[PDB]
Amino acid sequence: SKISEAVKRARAAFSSGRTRPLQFRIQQLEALQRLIQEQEQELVGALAADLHKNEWNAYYEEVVYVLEEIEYMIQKLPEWAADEPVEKTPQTQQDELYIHSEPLGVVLVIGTWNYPFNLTIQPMVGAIAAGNAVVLKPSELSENMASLLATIIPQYLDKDLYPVINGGVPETTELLKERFDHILYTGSTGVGKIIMTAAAKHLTPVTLELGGKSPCYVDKNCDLDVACRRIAWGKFMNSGQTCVAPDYILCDPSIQNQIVEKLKKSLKEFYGEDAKKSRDYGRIISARHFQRVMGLIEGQKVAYGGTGDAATRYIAPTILTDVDPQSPVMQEEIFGPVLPIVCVRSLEEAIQFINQREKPLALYMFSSNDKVIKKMIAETSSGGVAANDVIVHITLHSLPFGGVGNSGMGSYHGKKSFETFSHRRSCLVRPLMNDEGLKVRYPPSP
Amino acid sequence: SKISEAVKRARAAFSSGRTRPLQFRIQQLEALQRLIQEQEQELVGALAADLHKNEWNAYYEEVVYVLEEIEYMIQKLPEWAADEPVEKTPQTQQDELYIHSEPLGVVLVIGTWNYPFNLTIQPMVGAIAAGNAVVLKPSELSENMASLLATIIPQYLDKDLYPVINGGVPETTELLKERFDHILYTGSTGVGKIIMTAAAKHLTPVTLELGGKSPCYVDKNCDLDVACRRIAWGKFMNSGQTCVAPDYILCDPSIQNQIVEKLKKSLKEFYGEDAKKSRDYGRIISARHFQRVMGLIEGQKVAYGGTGDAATRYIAPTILTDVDPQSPVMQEEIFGPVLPIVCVRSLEEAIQFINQREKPLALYMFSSNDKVIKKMIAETSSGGVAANDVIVHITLHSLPFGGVGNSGMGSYHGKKSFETFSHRRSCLVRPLMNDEGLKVRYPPSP
Ligand SMILES: CC(=O)Nc1ccc(Nc2ccc(S(C)(=O)=O)cc2[N+](=O)[O-])cc1
Ligand SMILES: CC(=O)Nc1ccc(Nc2ccc(S(C)(=O)=O)cc2[N+](=O)[O-])cc1
């Protein structure tokens, strides 16, 4: 009964109080740091095999953000873990009022496949920092990374506290019968409901980082040269397989073709004339997803790319024009290198378009006008927002990353990770003295 | 069917953007303030009929805390709602980084019966302040308060935005099929799982204020006169029907009888020789609960009280001695005026006793030694903690109130209510100019 054994062993190890001193956690974190350094080439190998990442983007688009998180947490831990004194009242002057931070217990992190290292290990850094045992369940789709982590994690980190669980849906389903103190899951909206249903049975709090279609509004009087380069970058990295990728563009029909053009120009700079020959361009994860993505290109007006190779699972950077909001490519998260352009004739119409759909993980807008930015923000709802750039808003330690509605609940990154994986316990400490002022509360009343 | 209409009307009213300006929210809150003043005697009448509260404790043990919350929120709203600037990095100097607060949408508050006004309206204050539509579902067990709120709420507050839903389990069950943006529920652990299961279907975030047995540890060398007075107060108010009532006592067998004695002494001061003749002493809510509470007194060593009257649903303040941890009275939340005393022979044994059970909403300890206080806190887990008092820790605006594990998830009160009923949206605003520092990210890579 291996799953149950790993969980039981993790719980027992947590109960012994081993994780409580900050020294212990900082050292596990320092062990992770060494893992990342000593296994750099193996990590690159795994990412290359799974997603056709090269050595540069394997580091600068995934791994390096784990390191920065580790470095930041090690540094801020004593301050975060310290009891937090709070505002008193005229009646609680003599009292101590503070918030006490403590671990939840055993935490489950369920990873996903598009960034199989980062989206497994970054949440773990937080949960470790917060003093929890952490059970890991990597995605099977990132087969090479899943198998590597199961090997190297126990080589560096405490064996009982941080077990890795292998498998897929059947194994995952069985893991969710075990009692956890917190569950963090990154993946799809549909599975989020399953995680939550399973969590309810033990009243387990959850953090769900889910999906949706992240809109990208482009304004008329803005510099499209800068805009389209940034959009193309965030859209086409990892072959479009990014939760906060700009999924589609909204723009006035008068600027459509210029956008198409400036995108091509930027794409050619990134990946050359043929993207299949670029070491910087990725591949689709699985055969099933390759076909899903191809099927969305059908019956569409292609302005660029449009072709794919089933063997190596390559899809050329594709731009679609005059796209029908009801067509398949606009009815699901694309998660591939296909960028539809939908026309709207005003800011107000773009806002309405966004609000009639489920709330996205990210919302993007490009504009020189501060008032256009402020209005779209005030009148929409999304997990997070970036104006005049993409992706970057989820890499800053001071901005919590998370969804809302269908794109998720809860958040992590930086201090938020510590908070998410802790219980914040309200404490009141009074002196035990006969206080004559408190005698009014006691019966009988006058 | 008319449940569906109320929700739809509430959603449409929220969609119109009516709740967004702070002016509107403050107005609704000022209307609630008016309600509490103009309906003071009707509220007292309802609480007297349901729980045998008198006019003094109806106000000072319930209603006054709604008022303080309203006054505090009105005052702090502009500050809380304001965009919150966050720490920058050397690379985001030119940028704007802030957290934007926005309503979730339509909020459901499901109330409970023991404090049928406070535990319905206090959460509502927060959800209103945060700019949501708020659907209310009062507990049917507090039949008089449930029926009153359905009458008076629409007289003072916006009719579409803040509907009251009448009924019980069947009506509640049907309400949970509707799509909400947040659900707050106060009640039992068992029903919490149902709420959460229903919430998963729409990925609705939940705040669960649940139950458990709140322990009260009494140390050997502390002044038992002050201790037992405070314990008896918190234990026996509202006839023991309090989520954060000290449920049982843990103490060394050497101080047991003194405790029993000092409790009697305090009880006699509160409610006279016969508590049935005191207008300050409450009654059990329902016939079903009266019997539940009586059945827990059986086969137990009674040291005081022990008798009850089925007609008026009165149970005398009861103290049980040398109680077996395995007996019924120690295997469920008492929620009645029956105080068991369980013997432990050390602090370490008390800690172990607490940790082997489900996590309680509150943990109480009485001691002159701060090192004993600090140790029990560090080595246990509970929703909140009070040392050398009871109840009071959940009445301070700066201490979030909520559970952990089986005692619940999430929290509210003060600023936390505002946060809980909002989405905290991370915003990054960059200038749309050229940035040569950004060039390093674009392919082709080194
Ligand atoms: C900031 C920058 O220049 N480049 C850059 C490149 C890649 C990333 N990574 C990155 C991008 C998106 C996502 S997600 C959650 O939307 O799938 C996750 C990561 N991640 O954590 O690895 C983050 C930043
Ligand atoms: C602070 C003080 O002296 N007395 C005092 C007396 C009564 C209360 N009320 C009070 C006590 C407990 C609970 S609960 C959630 O545990 O059921 C709720 C309320 N309530 O309705 O606000 C709060 C404070």
Amino acid identity, position B32: L
Domain boundaries in chain A? Answer: 3-210+408-446, 213-407
| Resolution of the PDB structure in angstroms | 2.5
Nearest Cα of chain B lies from the Cα of A131 at a distance, in angstroms, of 13
DSSP label at residue A394: G
CB A133 within 8 A of CB A421: no
What are B232-235's contacts with CB under 8 Å, separation 24+? B232/B263, B232/B266, B232/B267, B232/B270, B232/B317, B233/A441, B233/A442, B233/A443, B233/B266, B233/B270, B233/B390, B233/B391, B234/B389, B234/B390, B234/B391, B235/B337, B235/B339, B235/B390
Dihedral class, residue B278 (left if φ above 0, else alpha if ψ from -120 to 50, else beta): beta
Residue with tokens 């190998």: A45
Number of helices (H), then strands (E), in chain B: 15, 17
Helix (H, G, I), strand (E, B) or coil at B250: strand
CB A168 within 8 A of CB A140: yes
Q: Is B206 helix (H, G, I), strand (E, B) or coil?
A: strand
The token duo for A170 is 């059947």
Rounded CA separation A80/A82 (Å): 6
Interface of B with A in 91-150 (CB under 8 A): 92, 97, 99-100, 102, 104
Q: How far, in Å, is the centroid of ligand 2 from the Cα of B413? A: 12
Q: Which long-range contacts (CB under 8 A, 24 or more apart) does B302-308 make?
A: B303/B260, B304/B260, B304/B263, B304/B264, B304/B267, B305/B275, B305/B337
Q: Are A102 and A423 in contact (CB under 8 A)?
A: yes
CA angle at B428 for the pair B422 and B430, rounded to the nearest 5°: 155
Q: CA A391 → CA A104, A231, A235, A364, B25, distances in Å?
A: 31, 9, 9, 9, 35
Residues in chain B: 446
What phi and psi, each to the nearest 5 degrees, are found at residue A133?
A: -70, 145
Q: How far is B398 from chain A (nearest CA, A)?
A: 6
Q: DSSP characters for A334-371?
A: --SSEEEEEE-SSHHHHHHHHHTSPPPSEEEEE-S-HH
Q: How many C-beta neighbours within 10 Å does residue A288 have?
A: 9
Please confirm, yes or no, whether B209 is among the known catalytic residues. Answer: yes
Count the alpha carbons within 13 Å of B318 in the hemisphere toward its beta carbon: 26
CA distance A414 to A399: 8
Strand order through the sheet with B422-429: A302-304, A318-320, A338-343, A248-251, A215-218, A362-366, A384-387, B422-429, B96-103, B84-85
Radius of gyration of chain B (CA): 24
Q: Is B3-210+408-446's fold the same as B213-407's?
A: no
Query: Nearest-CA neighbor of A421 among A162, A106, A36?
Result: A106
Residues whose CB falls within 8 Å of the CB of residue B281, separated by 6 or more in sequence, listed in order: A443, B52, B236, B239, B270, B271, B275, B317
Q: Are A209 and A186 in contact (CB under 8 A)?
A: yes
Judging contacts by C-beta atoms under 8 Å, the chain B residues touching residue A368 are 432
| Topology (CATH) of B213-407 | Aldehyde Dehydrogenase; Chain A, domain 2 (3.40.309)
Q: Examine the residue annotation and report whether A243 is marked as an active-site residue of this protein.
A: yes
* Whole-number Å distance between alpha carbons of A203 and A105: 14
Contact predicate A218/A203, CB 8 Å: no
- Are A226 and B433 inside 8 Å of each other by CB? yes
Distances (CA, A) of B67 to A429, B35, B60: 25, 10, 11
Q: What b/e string do you get for B401-433 counting C-beta neighbours within 10 Å, with b at 16 or more? A: bbbbbbbbbbbbbbbbbbbbbbbbbbbbbbebe
Q: What is the CATH number of domain A3-210+408-446?
A: 3.40.605.10
Phi, psi of B363 (to 5 degrees): -130, 130
Q: How far apart are CA B59 and CA B65, in angstroms?
A: 8
Report, in angstroms and rounded to the nearest whole number, the Rg of chain A calculated over CA atoms: 24
Looking at all shown ligands, the one closest to residue B69's CA atom is 2
Dihedral of CA atoms A356, A362, A368, A373 in degrees, nearest 10, equals 50
* Closest by Cα among A226, A238, A231, A222 to A319: A231
Method of determination?
X-ray
Question: Secondary structure of chain B: what % helix, strand, coil (to 5)?
Answer: 45, 15, 40
Outline where B201-242 has alpha helix (H).
224-236
Tokens 């005698």 correspond to what residue?
A: A439
CB contact under 8 A, B443 and A20: no
